[PDB]
Amino acid sequence: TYERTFVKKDAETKEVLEGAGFKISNSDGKFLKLTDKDGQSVSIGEGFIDVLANNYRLTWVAESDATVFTSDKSGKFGLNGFADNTTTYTAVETNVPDGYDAAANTDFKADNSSSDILDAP
Ligand SMILES: [Yb+3]
Ligand SMILES: [Yb+3]
Ligand SMILES: [Yb+3]
Ligand SMILES: [Yb+3]
């Protein structure tokens, strides 16, 4: 399996940003949802989510039911536990902190890498 990590930052100052929320979309216009091993919804918090340690499952669902991932105190968020490292996904900023405009969508692959996402004030 594979992971991906993002760091949310202010475009001008490069300071990290807490509280920016994202959904993740695939080519079929479906969005990522985390469940426990019994298929139940799980309450997740800010930051990187260790899917493996917690024995969660990744599923693809409609936008309204998707899991929202949120940058933490150090701007980090993301997860591990992807099956495929060759599929294009897109991080979509659904929850924008006051003071900022949404970042443009970010295409990515689960390639165990980490990249910045920038929000203009
Ligand atoms: Yb907490
Ligand atoms: Yb603006
Ligand atoms: Yb794109
Ligand atoms: Yb950076």
Author numbering: 177 to 297
Per the authors:
As the first reported host of “non-pathogenic-derived” pili, Lactobacillus rhamnosus GG is a gut-adapted commensal lactic acid bacterium (LAB) and one of many clinically investigated probiotic strains for human use in the prevention and treatment of certain gastric ailments. As with other Gram-positive bacteria, sortase-dependent piliation in L. rhamnosus GG (called SpaCBA) is assembled from the ~30 kDa SpaA (backbone), ~20 kDa SpaB (basal), and ~90 kDa SpaC (tip-located) pilins. Two immunoglobulin (Ig)-like subdomains comprise GG-SpaA, each having the conserved residues of a canonical E-box motif and internal isopeptide bonds formed between either lysine and asparagine or lysine and aspartate residues. Our findings show that the GG-SpaA structure has certain features in common with other pathogen-derived pilin-proteins, such as the Ig-like CnaB-type folds and the presence of internal isopeptide bonds6940.
